[PDB]
Enzyme design. Sequence first.
Site, PDB file in Angstrom:
ATOM      1  N   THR A 190       0.850  -1.225   0.000  1.00  0.00           N
ATOM      2  CA  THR A 190       0.000   0.000   0.000  1.00  0.00           C
ATOM      3  C   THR A 190       0.869   1.252   0.000  1.00  0.00           C
ATOM      4  OG1 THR A 190      -1.829  -1.083   1.191  1.00  0.00           O
ATOM      5  CG2 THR A 190      -1.761   1.340   1.244  1.00  0.00           C
ATOM      6  N   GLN A 191       0.553   2.182  -0.897  1.00  0.00           N
ATOM      7  CA  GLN A 191       1.218   3.478  -0.940  1.00  0.00           C
ATOM      8  C   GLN A 191       0.200   4.561  -1.284  1.00  0.00           C
ATOM      9  OE1 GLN A 191       0.826   1.567  -3.509  1.00  0.00           O
ATOM     10  NE2 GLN A 191       2.720   1.139  -4.647  1.00  0.00           N
TER      11      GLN A 191
END
Lengths: 244, 240, 195, 222, 233, 235, 204, 217, 231
Positions: E1-2
Amino acid sequence: GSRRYDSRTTIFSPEGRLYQVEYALESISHAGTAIGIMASDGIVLAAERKVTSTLLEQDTSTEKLYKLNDKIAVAVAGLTADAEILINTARIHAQNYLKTYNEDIPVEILVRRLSDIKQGYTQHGGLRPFGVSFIYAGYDDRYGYQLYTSNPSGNYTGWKAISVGANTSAAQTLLQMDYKDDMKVDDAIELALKTLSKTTDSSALTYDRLEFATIRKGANDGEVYQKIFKPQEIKDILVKTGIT
Amino acid sequence: GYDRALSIFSPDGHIFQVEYALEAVKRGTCAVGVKGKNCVVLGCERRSTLKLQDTRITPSKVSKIDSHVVLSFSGLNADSRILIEKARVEAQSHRLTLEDPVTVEYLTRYVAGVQQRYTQSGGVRPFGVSTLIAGFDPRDDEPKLYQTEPSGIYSSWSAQTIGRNSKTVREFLEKNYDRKEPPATVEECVKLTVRSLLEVVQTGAKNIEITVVKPDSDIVALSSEEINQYVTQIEQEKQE
Amino acid sequence: MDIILGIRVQDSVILASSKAVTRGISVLKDSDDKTRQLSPHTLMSFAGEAGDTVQFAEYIQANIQLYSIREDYELSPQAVSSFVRQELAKSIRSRRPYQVNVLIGGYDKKKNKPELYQIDYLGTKVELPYGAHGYSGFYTFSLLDHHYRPDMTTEEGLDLLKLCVQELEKRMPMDFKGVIVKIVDKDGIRQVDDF
Amino acid sequence: QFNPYGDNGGTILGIAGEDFAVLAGDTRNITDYSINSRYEPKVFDCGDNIVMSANGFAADGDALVKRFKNSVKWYHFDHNDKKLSINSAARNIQHLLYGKRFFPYYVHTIIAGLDEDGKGAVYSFDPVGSYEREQCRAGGAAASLIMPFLDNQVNFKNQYEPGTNGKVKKPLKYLSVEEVIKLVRDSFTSATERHIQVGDGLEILIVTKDGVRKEFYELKRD
Amino acid sequence: TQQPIVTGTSVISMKYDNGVIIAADNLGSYGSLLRFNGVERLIPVGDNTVVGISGDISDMQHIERLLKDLVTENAYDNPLADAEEALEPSYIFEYLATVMYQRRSKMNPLWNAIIVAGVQSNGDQFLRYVNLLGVTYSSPTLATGFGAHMANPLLRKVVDRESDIPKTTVQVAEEAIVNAMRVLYYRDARSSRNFSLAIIDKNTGLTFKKNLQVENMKWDFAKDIKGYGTQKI
Amino acid sequence: DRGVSTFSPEGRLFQVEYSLEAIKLGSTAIGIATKEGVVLGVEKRATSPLLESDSIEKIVEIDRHIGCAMSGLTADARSMIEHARTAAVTHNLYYDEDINVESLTQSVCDLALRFGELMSRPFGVALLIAGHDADDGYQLFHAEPSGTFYRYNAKAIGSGSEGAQAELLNEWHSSLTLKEAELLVLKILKQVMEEKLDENNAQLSCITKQDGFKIYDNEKTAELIKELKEKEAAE
Amino acid sequence: SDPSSINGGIVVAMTGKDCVAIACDLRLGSQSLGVSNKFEKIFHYGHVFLGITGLATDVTTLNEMFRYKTNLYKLKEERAIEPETFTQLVSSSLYERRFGPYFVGPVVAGINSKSGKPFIAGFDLIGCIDEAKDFIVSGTASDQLFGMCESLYEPNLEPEDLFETISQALLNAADRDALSGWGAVVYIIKKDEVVKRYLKMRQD
Amino acid sequence: KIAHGATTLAFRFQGGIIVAVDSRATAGNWVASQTVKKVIEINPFLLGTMAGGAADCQFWETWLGSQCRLHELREKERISVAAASRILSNLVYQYKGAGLSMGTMICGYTRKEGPTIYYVDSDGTRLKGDIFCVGSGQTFAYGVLDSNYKWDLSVEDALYLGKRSILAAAHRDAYSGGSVNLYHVTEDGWIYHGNHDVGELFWKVKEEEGSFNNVIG
Amino acid sequence: NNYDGDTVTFSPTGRLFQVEYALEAIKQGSVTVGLRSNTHAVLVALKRNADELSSYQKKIIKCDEHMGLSLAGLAPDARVLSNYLRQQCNYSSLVFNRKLAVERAGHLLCDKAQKNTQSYGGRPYGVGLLIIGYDKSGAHLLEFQPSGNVTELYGTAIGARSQGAKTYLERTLDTFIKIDGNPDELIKAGVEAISQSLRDESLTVDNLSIAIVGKDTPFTIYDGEAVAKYI
Ligand SMILES: [Mg+2]
Ligand SMILES: [Mg+2]
């Protein structure tokens, strides 16, 4: 590849013997004699240091008799370096048992554990076995005073009196002759030293060529004391028994 | 890890390491198993070359795997401890997952499987041990007696012997054991087991060990004096 | 589960454990035995999170039975309690800890003494004359503090135990459907079928 | 935070006849209030006379169908070109779905075909692999609009025979392929009117002993 | 996740009678800051495919490297690398789609929306979409981001269904694309005036147009707008 | 010494060829396939009269529709049977159906050549895998430690194999009944066995579509032995 | 919730003239519920004494761990471990669990057998050594103990005087803490004799 | 929105075991299915009930059947209900915390045990018992069971009691209904006793029994 | 002699004997023929039986809709290699939506076999393969040797007595290459080619095995009465 150079340490002979175990036992037969004698009121451990020198520092030296815990000790016959590997493992096992159950490890359980480790090296791993035979002297509240032996095969047996190392055939005959069941520690001390004195390859048996130890209930009231004898104390017991 | 194939085939189709493991069994002290109508008896030889022995603490030849099953052996003593330990662990593991203690056949099948595994696994040698496994299945009164060997084959026996001079005692059992009418009592079964060992043992003093297993976890080991009485009665009948 | 009690008298240890099993809304069973025999002279009762209780108890049982066969010897209650404590102390720092509290009632055949050990899920062990887990002690300890003697008989111990259960049945909100009582002494373990 | 799931809308319908089976689905693909495509095929011929649709999150739907088609191929390789029966396909799909029990394929799966006795068969799945053979099953967005209509017009639920007044049920007479297609078309036309994610086109796959046939019909594009 | 940092806005595209057209502006935004003004977001693969990418620019550069490596790998031990066994638009798309879905399935996506435009060996038009979720779809017109909301409606007036494709010429199609880019510049706050356009035709091949500008803009009417209701001056 | 996976100059794997010699020393096992079923029979060969012969398990169930007979180092067969049973049950779990006999045999044969320096040596046992499925009907397969399997109308393995196979060559035809096959296995077993054939030192079994795999009782086999003696004395 | 205050309890140590003293309460509880009045928190390995406050399961575990380690030390070294050396062993052992620590407050006390010098030390739950000349405090009433020790303590107290000082420091600190009390023990330690005294205190 | 809602029961009696379940599956207020099979046929001798997660119950009880088949191939003997229920409970216990949802009755009838029922739960619970009832309508079914249960019920009366108890729940519990599936477990295997539509069953029982006077018919 | 104990050892003349011994296993195997035109590619295989009761060992394996092979030597090794080809063909389709080129399939087989000839412990593959296929560049025929060497050919044969069929194809080269749009005539040429390798035995209905792939023809295997037409 690498197969070419493999000695195959864990195989049977056509006769059903383990080559490396047999050859390790041959090595042990040249080691200094160690004797264990069990009495009603204690156990004796006696052992001969191999051709020493006058410049060897004896009082700080230890090659034969080792402490596993406060209740159990061993006499060594064979490669000292190999023995110390196993001794440290046994010391740890005793402490693991004490931490788990909050009771001192029974003698046989410790002996079985070390013997199983020796067994493993004969069945798998492709490594050489430990060239060591032990005499275990110990006490617990189940069986009382106990003597055991183990050898590189990982087989162990219980004894009233036993010898390992050099001249065991001659030593065992002498022990079998003079040993009796109602014997006491002081008598057992004398028997052990007399047996070594006759079986030794040296000219004369002296204090500087010996290691000695007793496990006695001769401790103030219901408890057990280990006594690793000092050089001067070995000299005194040699005079007392009338050998020097 | 050490992966070397020690157990392999030879041109004539033999696995020598497995066959040499049997030679180790041939060297081992004699063990005998005899099942009666309502019991099984396990007899074992103790070589009298070793005196000054402490018989209290010395490892006994017959080992309890559970409260209802026992295991004796001939061959390498150190090797037998590994099979006994594994068997005991599996017995408790079976009780834990199936609720029910192992059958004698199941326990035998497990031990035999371990032995077989060591004949085609890399970096290991076969067990130099043959076993006699005996007991009674839970809630069953039919006696059970099985045998295993280094190769891993196993089978059921009315009576069987293993170890040194086992050929002789098997000869004795084959002519003396009747299938139509097996030893009806404990006495008759023990007597036949002691008789069979007396063909090989030498002296009937501390050289013979006897263990009687009965249904419902009733296992007991006979003492020296109790066995000595059988030895006395057998020879007195023989003097005729 | 809910209520487990223990009392050590002169010559025996008595364990009392509730019979109810509740799945949230309904009482699914009213005859559940919350105990396992570890050895002929050692009994363990248990209470905590569902599943974990039985799984843990049976795991311990198997290990002690294995030891008994291997050595042909019964471990002392003290030795068994230390083993159980270590397992719980190991468990509390695991990925998913055993959420189980236990009482261990045993008769030491060597010392000829009854022994009661209380161990919580953290691995907190104490030897006691009487013990409990959960909210059970909050009601019962005041009665035990008043009436208990070290020289009590087994029958007197059961009477004192009845008084404890009666107080629980009066003041506790949950219906725990009575208790199964078991006695541990020199002759082994037996169940009191009428209580 | 990253959300690995999405909703591509769409609605599917499987009906099992006496000696045939249909699997229908609308061709509209969406995100939120936008149309991605007016014609994106959603029902697929997977071989061995089996048709399949995995409705919901299209990425998971395409992945599952692709893996099942792959399973049919390897079933032939491993078992001497044996025909994969509809019941065997259904069980296989359960294991594909349950294999991702703790990170599920976000789809409602339906397969259709013929059983080993030649009779029409439809199987329905939940996202984590529970399945069941059914005579009639709508899946996806407008499933709630379609199923009550099918209960009434396929299974004749709440319908009784005139004159008896609730005493005698309407008999469960078998429907032809022409009759089923009429009910499918009216189901989707009604769904299109009241559900924003349903429209554009209707594609129907019909399965018989002769093989797999296709029919297409226009739906409202608003 | 970013989270996406440097981002590219809409990519728009459509089919016409003999091929496909695709376009995207040259901006790399850093939130509300219009940071980088010379970013090429259309990346050609061979002479038959153009991959248009929106979203995170760092991930776009990674994808650009994957496609470059794909061409190299395809040429290995391949005597027909520039003929029968050349990379097709369908091969390039399926590869990207596989990567996108795999990356979302490890909870570490490439934060992009991608359109692959090209012409196949048999002359067939190829146009398909894929994004960070691995979602794929095809349509006569395709657009990402704001383009989906504003460009598609305009492009769908030209090609509303499949049957309108043969009736649409390259001049009409390009006109519609250029007009859509103007509308996006009027209305998308993260767009730029400068853009690139690519045509892939089955006859005339790949035509790549750089440094295009939005022109013919209507702003004059702004002078008459005063206040927000009542104000007259 | 030398590698375990070494080729001979003739192009054969030494260890595989040597395992085949171990199988030749094994007890005889015979299989006969008919349109009414497949029959499997074995020589028990007890080493002593005190050995309880009913504990000799050389015929084994893999599934309801598949049976198996063994010859050679029989201890090696246990892990092969375990794998076969698991493969059969696993396929039923995945596909809600019975597994094809050929597919089961192929799964067993995949283990064969998984040896090197995986297990340390090839298997020293051959298997006769018999069964029925809907596609190919009644089938009999011969699974070797080479990893190769042949389908057979009839097949013998073990010490008396080449003599028994020659006898099966003449006797087998495509219209054999199940009863005829049973007697034929008993006849050929009796011919190649050292000891005299009876119900205690020989075992029969079969696989039919209706009843599935069944090991024959000693009472049932004893009747078939008596039926055989009379029909041979009839001419 | 807070692991260091579930079970409760306290330990205090002090130095005197040719002597050291270490003392502790006997309570073990489950928050408000008093469970045991015989939970001793002071242990000894040879002549080195270790008090441990905090989570009771860790108190027990660490005692078993240091018994384990000091027994192996003695077998290999052929001599009993000294207070200075043991202090380093406690610190090392605690720090190896840096990011999964034992929730404890250890206190070492003893006299070096060779030099005859009195020694005390305290630690936090992760290994930091506090080697004070005067006194060390630990547990749920550590604030109270700091107040008592800081006023009552004076240097070079004789063994029998030191007993009174440390006893009064513990008792009055414990009586101002709900989770401490229920009995107390005091060890008076000289070079070759150690006296253990159980104190009479209020049982609430 | 996974499916939710159910009424399942099982009870031991003189003639073996009665298993009875409803047929409804709901995703929120939406009724997904009225035709769900909530009794899993593990093998011809063993039955399991479905409550909680539909997939979890289906998948792992089918799997249980595979393990039971492997057991009897290896041991040449029918698996006990104790052993089978234990294989399932030990399996789900490994998954504890991961989010499995299961509340099931493993039902069987063997020689050594007789008729046996084990309640097995996804949190690891394994309980032997005579009467179990699981689901959103469990409390309604318990009322009818407790007040009418005897060990010496006939097979006919026991079947009706199980049918009547599901009906009670189906009436009052919104998430139970559709139809009733009945099973009778004997030592020689289970016997299916039909599918019974609740709509038709309700009116039939109302008239014949005189119950449900609160409802106009 | 002293240099044939394992695959990791060159002989003094630079030979790898274990590889050569693996090559010998192929020569013992039954004959199989491969040939192609511009439109189609054909495999013909003489199957071998154990005895009259036994079945005839299958020689041809399908790898994809457009590709497959025939084997000669150790059959289990062919199963391993064919399985690998099935996976590689499948990886190409799933990831790139692309049918695997026959030439590239040969390169992958070469590299897989090579690793077994340079490492200690393992062994070379003991089988030879004839791969046929139809891809974007038309019909193809490959010959695989377990030394690693893969060769693209118009026609070939491997196995026992394969030299006879190989000579026939060398004469017929100009004729059979031109057989376009006529599958039956191309098979006839293959059946006539394999007939040059026969001694004593002849082509029967359960002896012969044929496979074909082409422009509008998926890889299909013919056995039993399906090949009676060509006998
Ligand atoms: Mg609509
Ligand atoms: Mg208070």
